[PDB]
A paper describes a structure:
Polyketide synthase 13 ([name]) of [name], the bacterial organism causing tuberculosis, catalyses the last step of mycolic acid synthesis prior to export to and assembly in the cell wall. [name] is an iterative type I Pks composed of a sequence of catalytic and acyl carrier protein (ACP) domains separated by non-globular linker regions. Sandwiched between the functional ACPs are the central ketoacyl synthase (KS) and acyltransferase (AT) domains, which facilitate the condensation reaction, while the TE domain at the C-terminus loads the newly formed mycolate onto a trehalose. Due to its essentiality, [name] is a target for several novel anti-tubercular inhibitors, but its 3D structure and catalytic reaction mechanism remain to be fully elucidated.
The structural model covers residues 106–550 and 596–1073 of the amino acid sequence of Mt-[name] for both monomers. The central KS domain dimer is resolved best, with local resolution down to 3.2 Å, while the distal ends of the AT domains show a spatial resolution of around 5 Å. Analysis of the KS dimer interface using PISA indicates a buried surface area of ~3500 Å2 per monomer. Reversible self-association aligns with a largely polar character of the dimer interface, which includes a small set of salt bridge interactions and about 35 H-bonds across the interface, contrasting with few hydrophobic interactions. Despite the disordered linker sequence between the KS and AT domains (residues 551–595), a stable relative orientation of the KS and AT domains is maintained through their extensive non-covalent contact interface (~2900 Å2 of solvent-accessible surface area buried). The cryoEM structure of Mt-[name] was obtained without substrates or inhibitors present in the protein solution. Our cryoEM map shows continuous backbone density for both subunits in the region N-terminal to residue Asp118, which clearly indicates an extended conformation of the ACP-KS linker sequence rather than a turn. As a result, the ACP of chain A likely associates with the KS domain of the opposite subunit (and vice versa).
Numbering used by the authors:
A (entry chain B): 106 to 550, 596 to 1073
B (entry chain A): 106 to 549, 596 to 1073
Write the structure that this text describes.
């Protein structure tokens, strides 16, 4: 229990990993926005259709709509919401919005652009600092003074804009709304940066929105004087300037600490070095700018960033196109930035306001987007509407050079640098210093190991592998949604895109990666493919509804976790786990660790037998090798994020089971399995003749056995495999007599010709030596609920008490195995998914029979590696199935870490079914 | 310039130095609030006479309003604003959102409660984080969308609530309005704390405000249908809980870094240690409280503070009074705060909502008052409306215990701790932990007096202690932004001082209280010894009648002062000795220059000052007057005075060199002794054929240039006035002009001086003056010099070195141009002259010259006099400097206050308000 104060908040650079735009004419993606900037577009139009259609009544308001300057930037389709995506009823979805629609959708788009799964942030400390300015839908919220509506407080409140975002996405972090007029987005970004720096949140969504709903604000802005341009365009720092115009839109940015963005392997677009914010006092008039105030903002921001303001290559300015504000801004800029510039290194001016207009509270977002895009495409957009340098600004006296044609970056200090300024009409100034990505923030600051023979055989095997065919790897394409119809439609779209030339030119692995870095919704589907044609066929199957040999698609998560069936009675095949050792590294490391342990215990190395294909097997070597492969498989699964919920183990697959439950540790499990195997080795080497036993898989139940031992009292029960079948072992004579009886009673019988007939009577001498060996292990509290087949199948609850002592390993070896009772108890406790970790799946048939008798016929049997199969593909299929059914699996960990934008694909984005959700408001 | 990545932020504790209040019931200072809390008053009332009165016109909404849950903590006087005080016009003032008016007034009240004058914060890094969750005045103001007024965007907006506060008070710091529903205040405070910890502000005014203007929001909040209590009394953590009611009223807090509060001298009311804020996430919807989030805020807050939550005493909580939310808050509290309590330790619980209601965005402002006020009076207030423990929450199970009667402070683990929690209805949660003030956070070669000086000082202190004490003169400083307001404030203060509480208060305490208030444009000062003199002076100020010790002014004097460093024959037997015995800065500087003069010639001037038997020769008088001038000016500059222009005379040039930045100290000492020893040696060796006897005559420059061929060896010594002139020459030609002017009608007052300077007689002496002024460095002056050496022409500030060896060579020979320099000062606006000598002799000449040049309202301030107590004289000069509007820090006139007994509850500032409201046609 530590309570000793947090610690200092170190000043660090803040990476930017995502970005999304809904600008009033620069279009709705950060690739359309870049095209519009690079070409140079104008988003100013007249009132589309009827947008004030509501206030267009009261026929005198109509006159002043056609009397006030009503041009500006508008956004098509303000009314639109996929209410079933965002889980809002029809009666509620119209009382919300429209700024909260834009916020909710822009958060999704920014998270998709950053390529972080939106489902990986639910239940995490993610701050949401959103800046809004006006509440004008609330007017529509109350239009009939004969009724009143609920849902109105949370529907059109201003705080609730930044709360709903935290609600829907389940963000447990500081969620506030900001209001500082025309600078809300920049101060919101500044506060997000501060929150990230003092460790309140790990990822922050920042930005701002703005919507134009009523003409009342425009009418009020009209009656101030000459503040609104008759033309409807904005020419910043030009000879001509007669006012700005008001636009609607919004922007969002996903901020992350630079170390966090390097560790998580994301692509950094640009870093923020520092920022500042202040007020301007007087400022003779509430809406009059100041020079010393803005110079103070610049100085504080650039001292926070730790850079020299005279090495800045570009300055995105406020530039609201005023004959009085612009000279003041230019002089303030030149007093700090253009102070000692040697007349040949001028700072480039340029304002995004000439393309989009004045975006109010979202203005600081829009500029930011530009400065980010120009810092990733390595260009500089030109500023439109510029006629000629203004009389009241002496450009060459300062270091200002208003660009007109797309230039390249003038790196006056080596790396690209920029500054974004924004000044509100209340007097709140903000300035953000945006750098470019740099090399400095992508680079970081005993046991008997393998023997000498192992090296030789490994060297031979690697060349033999490198002297074979060029096999096509198996790639999982993962499609997902929150419903089933959405998943089908998305699969159809992805299949269609995969056939066009862009889809055909894209590598399969890149498409798989881009799919694996998306949202993992409730409904999931996976298509395992080798080339494009197989992928298209499987995606068509998913979209239609049919099944396929290697295509999985379920409707909802399985409620209960898996049960790891640690099997391995008769699972050996001569090439046990050799391919995976060469072609997978975690498997090889865990195998070598187990080899070191086994070498310490017994003397020989499992790795030699595994790699070599000359020596065959035997009960000792078979058991130890199967245990080693089981451990390696379990750790490979748990390296990708798999977690057992219960564990059941049969015979030799018991010790490994212990390690997977927290009932022992790897060394103790190795102890137990090696001692056991050595005991059977020597015992079966000795006991023959008057001591020979046998085994038989007879079709007798637990009760049909209770009336069949009377004739042959000396037989015993080895394993209760299924509630139809059972392994019997006893004297040879009585064994063939029972086979003859089974033949004449309609009962299948088959002899297992294995010397090591354990669990019956041959181990009576051996257990004493066992007592000499295993004494000294330390059982601990089980972190996983074990279905003890040795204790007749009681669901020993996690965390209770150590249950793995020397008697348990003695009794389990001596007495019978209660597999079917344990499985029956498991299916009656909720579990439906069983995962068998064995070289060759043989126990899934027994599990299928037991679960079929127990009532549940639609189970989920998931096998590991098998014979005459590609082991890498088997592992991929097992992990894909785990992903589909809903269990713990990080799909992003399959595909390797990328290098650049060429390792991903331009897969189609998600779609929303937007319906007109508007309120009938008569004024 | 250096740009090297401003260092990190260090997690320090934030002191609260001020506080305001406009809660229901306690509509005033935080001393009525304490009475109402300790009394258990209920501020929840019904609908006032007319509250809405706008939408209560249509006979449809009227019935629904009449059948709604419309009881709550309604405030009186929402429509009253003091327009003239806040400089806004009329048509602008009816628009301004009442939330903005409330914030404007509460900021002033907080700055008064903290005892930090508002005018002292002009144009500095002052952050303004204000929380506000609604603007329903936009409905009324932007109603009638036909002919609506221009001012609705600037006026009734939300980003402007904090921006007007930053504007009016001229705060250059981060100003922002915050919106997180019912947690806004507790969030804003939190953000302010972070600012003070990363260096983006120095004093932060953080708080919240809320107002009920429209019933539509109330009727809507009634919906759902089961969250508004029938009666209205919020019963929190009780068996009965039928909802909550709305309220209005806000609150501010003046936050400072604890180091700043310690260093300045303010009284630390309480200390915030940590704060945290997060969101619920998804639990059961927006308006469904989640418990794991409400435990996480507590854990993060108490790890940010570094405080173990199992030692907190008071858990002032949300207490919304809902039948479901309160148990959830209880489990949240018991999981973190009361987890491991050794079973006595009943984690005393309380809520302020039961006295004032639910204040929405200002809720975190209400609780932060209750916890602070209690922390200032060392006693928990009772919490009303607690019938019995609720069935669903087991109080004794976790650690909980409701408080019902005024209870003393448990002090588990040492000091007093607390915790304020707010949980918004949108999902935002905030928790702030407050400590108690602690013993920490409040605490942490040139010879001097020689042996002979020590002995004489001991004798002088014996003599000083022999005589009894006399009442010290105390300046009472009244100020306002208008003449009428200052008059009214003076009248009210006099009425207060006639009252018994105003009769049992020490005058020093009243002065101290008045010195830490806003110093406006109109100013007035009354210097008094006892209460009746003060009362009569205050009545004179209110009436407008003049008085000896009363000073008053209608507006600031534009140009800066002029330090007339002069004096010829102003010496007497005991100058500069009484204030040396009753002031330590003056004494320190006297000894500082005494070391230098000991270095220069052979001896200490302080010995001459102490001993009263010394016969003041020319050399000794010159150096003593130089030392007195230096100490006087540096004492004046220690209190914040700053000369705008200096002008010397004779031996006044040497000190003007130091006070203009043209020279360092040792340079001025070298100059003054180089002059003095030479004159001292030279004067004795002069006789009948050699003495150039100086005498004053009453002939101006033209009237001496006319009659100058009559008198050959006579010469100008000092141009003193546009009519007078000091002349020097051989005695017979002196007497001849004296006698002729006697008949002509002129005045020939003769000087009995013997070391006659400003003559051709000094030519022999200049040879050693040349060699005794070497090694000094003239330096660029920091302010203008009206040098009398160079004819009197002005010299601009920050130019080139002037006081070189040749400059002093000219100064010791050629005539003094005092009168022309004074007239040149007249030319460029200057009106105030302050004369630094132990006797105001040059003031007469300056007065005559200013009368010549057309100034009849010329402010001429003498510093010291003879046969006048020197400390009283200095207090008078410094009060006059304050009065006229120059740069004097009046708060430094008094001593550091050791407790609340050192201040006086003087009447507060008054706001004369008028009704500003819009038409109600909605």
């Amino acid at each position: 229990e530590d309570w000793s104060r947090t610690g200092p908040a170190e000043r660090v650079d803040i990476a930017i990993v995502g970005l999304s735009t809904r600008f009033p004419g620069e279009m709705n993606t950060p690739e359309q926005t870049w095209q519009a900037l690079l070409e140079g577009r104008d988003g100013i139009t007249d009132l589309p259709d009827g947008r004030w259609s509501e206030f267009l009544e009261e026929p005198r308001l109509a006159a002043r709509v056609a009397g006030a300057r009503t041009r500006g930037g508008y956004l098509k389709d303000i009314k639109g919401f996929d209410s079933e995506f965002f889980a809002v009823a029809k009666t509620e979805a119209d009382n919300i919005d429209p700024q909260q629609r834009m916020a909710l959708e822009l958060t999704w788009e920014a998270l998709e652009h950053a390529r972080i799964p939106a489902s990986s942030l639910r239940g995490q400390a993610v701050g949401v600092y959103i800046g809004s300015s006006t509440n004008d839908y609330s007017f529509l919220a109350v239009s009939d003074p004969t009724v009143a509506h609920p849902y109105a407080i949370t529907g059109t409140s201003s705080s609730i804009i930044a709360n709903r975002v935290s609600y829907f996405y389940d963000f447990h972090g500081p969620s506030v709304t900001i209001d500082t007029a025309c600078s809300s987005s920049l101060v919101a970004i500044h506060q997000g940066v501060q929150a990230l720096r003092n460790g309140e949140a790990d990822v922050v969504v920042a930005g701002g929105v703005n919507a134009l709903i009523t003409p009342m604000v425009t009418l009020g802005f009209d009656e101030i004087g000459a503040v609104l341009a008759p033309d409807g365009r904005i020419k910043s720092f030009s000879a001509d300037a007669d006012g700005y115009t008001r636009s609607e839109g919004g922007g969002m940015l996903v901020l992350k600490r630079v170390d966090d963005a390097r560790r998580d392997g994301d692509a950094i677009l640009a870093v923020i070095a520092g920022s500042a914010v202040n007020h301007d006092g007087r400022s003779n008039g509430l809406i009059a700018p100041n020079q010393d105030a803005q110079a103070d903002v610049l100085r504080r921001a650039y001292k926070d960033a730790g850079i020299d303001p005279r090495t800045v290559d570009y300055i995105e300015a406020h530039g609201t196109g005023t004959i009085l504000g612009d000279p003041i801004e230019a002089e303030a800029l030149g007093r700090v930035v253009g102070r000692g510039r040697p007349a040949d290194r001028p700072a480039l001016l340029g304002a995004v306001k000439t393309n989009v207009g004045h975006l109010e509270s979202a203005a600081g977002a829009a500029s930011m987007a530009k400065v980010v895009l120009a810092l990733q495409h390595d260009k500089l957009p030109p500023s439109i509407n510029f006629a000629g340098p203004s009389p009241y600004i002496d450009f060459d006296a300062m270091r200002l050079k208003m660009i007109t044609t797309p230039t390249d970056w003038p790196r006056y200090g080596g790396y690209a640098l920029a500054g974004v300024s924004s000044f509100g009409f209340g007097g709140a100034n903000a300035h953000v210093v945006v750098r470019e990505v740099l090399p400095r923030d992508v680079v970081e600051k005993e046991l008997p190991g393998v023997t000498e023979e192992a090296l030789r055989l490994k060297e031979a095997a690697l060349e033999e592998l490198a002297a074979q065919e060029v096999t096509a790897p198996l790639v999982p394409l993962a499609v997902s949604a929150f419903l089933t119809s959405r998943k089908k439609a998305a699969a159809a779209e992805l299949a269609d895109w995969m056939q066009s030339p862009e889809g055909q030119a894209s590598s399969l692995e890149s498409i798989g990666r881009s799919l694996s870095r998306r949202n993992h919704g409730r409904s999931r589907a996976v298509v395992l493919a080798h080339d494009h044609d197989e992928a298209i066929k499987g995606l068509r199957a998913v979209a239609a509804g049919k099944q396929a040999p290697n295509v999985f698609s379920v409707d909802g998560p399985v409620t209960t976790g898996p049960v790891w069936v640690l099997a391995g009675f008769g699972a050996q095949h001569r090439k046990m786990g050799k391919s995976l050792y060469l072609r997978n590294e975690v498997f090889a490391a865990w195998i070598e660790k187990v080899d070191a342990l086994v070498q310490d215990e017994l003397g020989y190395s499992v790795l030699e037998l595994i790699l070599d294909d000359a020596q065959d097997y035997g009960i000792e070597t078979t058991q130890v090798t199967i245990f080693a492969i089981q451990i390696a498989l379990g750790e490979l699964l748990r390296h990708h994020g798999a977690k057992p919920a219960a564990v059941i183990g049969q015979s030799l697959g018991e010790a490994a089971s212990a390690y997977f439950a927290g009932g022992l540790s790897l060394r103790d499990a190795t102890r137990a399995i090696c001692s056991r195997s050595h005991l059977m080795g020597e015992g079966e080497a000795m006991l023959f003749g008057e001591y020979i036993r046998l085994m038989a898989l007879v079709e007798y139940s637990a009760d049909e056995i209770r009336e069949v031992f009377s004739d042959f009292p000396d037989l015993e029960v080895c394993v209760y495999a299924a509630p139809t079948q059972t392994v019997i072992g006893g004297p040879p004579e009585q064994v063939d007599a029972i086979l003859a009886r089974a033949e004449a009673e309609g009962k299948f019988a088959r002899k297992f010709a294995t010397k090591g007939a354990s669990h019956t009577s041959q181990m009576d001498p051996l257990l004493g030596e066992l007592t000499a060996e295993l004494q000294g292990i330390k059982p601990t509290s089980p972190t996983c609920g074990i279905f003890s087949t040795v204790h007749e199948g009681r669901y020993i609850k996690p965390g209770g008490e150590p249950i793995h002592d020397v008697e348990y390993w003695k009794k389990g070896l001596r007495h019978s195995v209660y597999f079917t009772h344990g499985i029956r108890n498991a299916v009656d406790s909720g579990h439906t998914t069983f995962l068998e970790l064995a070289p060759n799946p043989v126990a899934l048939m027994q599990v299928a029979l037991t679960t079929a008798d127990a009532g549940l016929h639609d189970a989920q049997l998931i096998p590991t590696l098998a014979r005459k199969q590609d082991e890498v593909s088997s592992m991929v299929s097992t992990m894909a199935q785990l992903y589909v059914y809903g269990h713990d699996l990080d799909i992003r960990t399959l595909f390797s870490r990328a290098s650049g934008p060429q390792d991903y694909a331009n897969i189609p984005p998600t779609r929303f079914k937007r319906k007109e959700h508007w309120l009938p408001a008569h004024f």
